[PDB]
């Protein structure tokens, strides 16, 4: 009847310009406000902006300065440009529809899938590793910081230490970079005996890092 579907790039470098498109199936660009929204954690779900077949635009004021939305009545598409993106703009973008006229009780309908957009660093970079010193088991770890892209593989003592090891998923941070931690739980009877070493391997940057972990004071 009227189904919408959006195309996007997926991965985008920081400070470059994000351009998304949405396609309408069948019906003309009639009594509808063609809308763009986005959803994520942190920022939740927010409305980006809508546009009418005439060219009339309405944007989110907090985003109005950067946002630009367009129509192509000819091709049956409508588009979004964002201008200068950051890792905070990393979210799932949706194209949807509003009905022309009254807006007080209106809701968006005929949503898209839509398209996950990840904004990250423009350049490949190796991680920086730092020891997580411990205090009948105690836990010690390795911290890999500020790297791109994924993935990074962490092993302990060349893979000789396997038990009690848990490597957490990474965080995409405002820098457009990733960072994760890998923690092993070990006998408190240990320490001062049996050295613990974090082996970090980040292939895209030819980075390999071995780091000794042991308590201080």
């Amino acid at each position: 009847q009227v189904q919408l579907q959006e195309s996007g790039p997926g991965l985008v470098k920081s400070s470059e310009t994000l351009s998304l498109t949405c396609t309408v199936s069948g019906g003309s660009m009639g009594g509808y406000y063609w809308s763009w929204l986005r959803q994520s954690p942190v920022k939740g779900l927010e409305w980006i902006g809508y546009i009418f077949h005439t060219g009339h635009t309405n944007y989110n004021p907090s985003l109005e300065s950067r946002v630009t939305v367009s129509v192509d009545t000819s091709e049956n598409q409508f588009s979004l440009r964002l201008r200068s993106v950051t890792a905070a703009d990393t979210a799932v973008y949706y194209c949807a529809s509003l009905p022309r006229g009254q807006l007080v009780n209106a809701f968006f309908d005929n949503w898209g899938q839509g398209t996950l957009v990840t904004v990250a660093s423009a350049s490949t970079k190796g991680p920086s590793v730092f020891p997580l010193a411990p205090s009948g088991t105690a836990a010690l770890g390795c911290l890999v910081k500020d790297y791109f892209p994924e993935p990074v593989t962490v092993s302990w003592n060349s893979g000789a230490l396997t038990s009690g090891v848990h490597t957490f998923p990474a965080v995409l941070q405002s820098s457009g970079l990733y960072s994760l931690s890998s923690v092993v739980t070990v006998p408190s009877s240990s320490l001062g005996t049996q050295t613990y070493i974090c082996n970090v391997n980040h292939k895209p940057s030819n980075t390999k890092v071995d780091k000794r972990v042991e308590p201080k004071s």
Binding site: W47, F107, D109, V171
Partner: protein, 209 residues
């Protein structure tokens, strides 16, 4: 601004899940409800406070009293497990949505989170930068709020937090990084990581020795 709704809300299957969209502006204007799931087009599950769109299960029930909107699910089922957002029209922002509510249907037996907090390292401090690592593991369901505390008063900036990821043992794991300047760390008496899962909240505390 996003008015207010609880982050979590969970239920055993068939139990009744109640979500609250409250926040002042909710008196002037009518409220609708959207559900959101990954790899799937979100849909209106409510509009005009109480009205029931097409093809939407009768079990959902929607109401509004005073300055508080409410989406009730009634006999909830695994399909309903999603993120629910509350929407209200506004004159200038054109729209305002909710903080979001992650309705979770169990599932498995519940599990309290195991938390481990690591202070900034010497090597990192010598390289200026400082970072605090709060690690949360083995908890169910996958819904945890993480707040940070300088001495004992919440921290706004430099907080990054993963979304909970399922691990091999079917439980969830999440991590939270609090980024700090050197002086920042030794200045305050201590720093604290505070993770509240379901009803309970547990706290881990560290100091610059």
């Amino acid at each position: 601004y996003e008015l207010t709704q609880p982050p979590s809300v969970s239920v055993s299957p068939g139990q009744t899940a109640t979500i609250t969209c409250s926040g002042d502006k909710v008196a002037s204007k009518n409220v609708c409800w959207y559900q959101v799931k990954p790899g799937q087009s979100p849909e209106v599950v409510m509009y005009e406070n109480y009205k029931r769109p097409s093809g939407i299960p009768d079990r959902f029930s929607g109401s509004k009293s005073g300055s508080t909107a409410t989406l009730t699910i009634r006999g909830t089922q695994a399909t309903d497990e999603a993120d629910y957002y509350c929407q209200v029209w506004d004159s200038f922002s054109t729209f305002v949505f909710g903080s979001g509510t992650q309705v979770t249907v169990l599932g498995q037996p519940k599990a309290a989170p195991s938390v481990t907090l690591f202070p900034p390292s010497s090597e990192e401090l010598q390289a200026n930068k400082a970072t605090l690592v709060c690690l949360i593991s083995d908890f169910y369901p996958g819904a945890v709020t993480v707040a940070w505390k300088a001495d004992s008063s919440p921290v706004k900036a430099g907080v990054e937090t993963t979304t909970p990821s399922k691990q091999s043992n079917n439980k969830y794991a999440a991590s939270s990084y609090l980024s700090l300047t050197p002086e920042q760390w030794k200045s305050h008496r201590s720093y604290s990581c505070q993770v509240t899962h379901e009803g309970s909240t547990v706290e881990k505390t560290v100091a610059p020795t």
